Amino acid sequence: SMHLICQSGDVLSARYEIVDTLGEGAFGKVVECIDHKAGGRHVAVKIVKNVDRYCEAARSEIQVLEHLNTTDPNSTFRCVQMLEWFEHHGHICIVFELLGLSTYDFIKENGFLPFRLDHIRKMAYQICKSVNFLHSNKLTHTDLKPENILFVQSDYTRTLINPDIKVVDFGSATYDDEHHSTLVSTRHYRAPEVILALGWSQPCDVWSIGCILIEYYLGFTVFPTHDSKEHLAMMERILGPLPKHMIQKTRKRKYFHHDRLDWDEHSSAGRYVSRACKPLKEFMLSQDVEHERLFDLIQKMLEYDPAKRITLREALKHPFFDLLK
Ligand SMILES: Cn1cc(-c2ccc3occ(-c4cccc(Oc5ccccc5)c4)c3n2)cn1
Numbered sequence: 001s002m003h004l005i006c007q008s009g010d011v012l013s014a015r016y017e018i019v020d021t022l023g024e025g026a027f028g029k030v031v032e033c034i035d036h037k038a039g040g041r042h043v044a045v046k047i048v049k050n051v052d053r054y055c056e057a058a059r060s061e062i063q064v065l066e067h068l069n070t071t072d073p074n075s076t077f078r079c080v081q082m083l084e085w086f087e088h089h090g091h092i093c094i095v096f097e098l099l100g101l102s103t104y105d106f107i108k109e110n111g112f113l114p115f116r117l118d119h120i121r122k123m124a125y126q127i128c129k130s131v132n133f134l135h136s137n138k139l140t141h142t143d144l145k146p147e148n149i150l151f152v153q154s155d156y157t158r159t160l161i162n163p164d165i166k167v168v169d170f171g172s173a174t175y176d177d178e179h180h181s182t183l184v185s186t187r188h189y190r191a192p193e194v195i196l197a198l199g200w201s202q203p204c205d206v207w208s209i210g211c212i213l214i215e216y217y218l219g220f221t222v223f224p225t226h227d228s229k230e231h232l233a234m235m236e237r238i239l240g241p242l243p244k245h246m247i248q249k250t251r252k253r254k255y256f257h258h259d260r261l262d263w264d265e266h267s268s269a270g271r272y273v274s275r276a277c278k279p280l281k282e283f284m285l286s287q288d289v290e291h292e293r294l295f296d297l298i299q300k301m302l303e304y305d306p307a308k309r310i311t312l313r314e315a316l317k318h319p320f321f322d323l324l325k
Helices: 052-069 101-108 116-138 203-218 229-240 244-249 268-274 288-299 321-322
Strands: 016-025 027-034 041-048 082-088 092-098 149-151 165-167
Touching: 016 041, 027 092, 041 052, 052 082, 052 092, 101 149, 101 203, 116 165, 116 203, 116 288, 116 321, 203 288, 229 268, 288 321
Parallel strands: none
Antiparallel strands: 016 027, 027 041, 041 092, 082 092, 149 165
16 A cells, blocks of 8 residues: 555655655645755655556656646746656656645635635736646646645745745646546536536636635635536526526436426525525625626636636736736
8 A cells, every 4th residue: 555655754766755744635645755866855746546547647647747847947837847757666656846735725724714815816817827828738737626726835824925826736637639538627626518528628727717716715615516416506506597508519418408407496405505505796705896806707717608718818817917917
């Protein structure tokens, strides 16, 4: 098991000495190491489970990282830098520059207190610029979520001093000309064209970013569900009814009666959705214009039609970012 090879004091690749576990995910774990062959630099090493699905994603991630890091050697667009990779007792291990805490861990460890709006603005801008760089290079991330946005530095007292981020986890990233998996994204961040199996591309990341920004603002998801039908019902309650053209195209005709979701609003699930969800703008905590600007951007990211949906190039110009400029 991975447990036998990921302990503090263990030495990987004859140079990386584990000093701590940073986090875990479905894929394995990430550990902080001292690199004895780079003057004691601390690095992060992602130790990948020895399971086909995850080995395959790691191999994919290595190839995407080699491309992105070569294309952007200064990390101007804030994708994490891969230093090397190796195998250890049959596990793929990817070595990265050491970043700080995930945005998820930060919010969680603060009891789900939301980020300050000023920090949201800076973070949102950087996420948009980073993912736009993927988009420019015929890539879609597909698995954006707060866990995959990390702070660059440990620049906090937790109270944040500088909110600079990088994007991680390129194990699901897909090239335009590549086989597109049927199911992508973590459910709460998954776009409607994904759910409805309508085909997806870069716009599905923009949907995911909208969902991230809501979460940073509120401390919680507006899609608190583990079911696809209920997810769609929540969308309807927050954003209005889905477009006819999307309903008519879906092979998932089951879900709809005459271009309305086949959903009993008076059932237990129906009552739950009516309580937890409401029109997007009603979640605003202030009527101040900077909050209205954020919510206007989020509404455009959560456009149902992936063609009409704002692009990240466009998002970077939105009025919400004017305080940075
Ligand atoms: C998924 N992934 C994570 C990395 C990566 C690359 C460089 C890093 O420098 C510090 C961390 C790190 C800091 C706190 C928690 C943490 O654990 C995680 C983070 C995300 C998903 C699950 C576990 C990792 C770190 N993580 C690359 N791919």
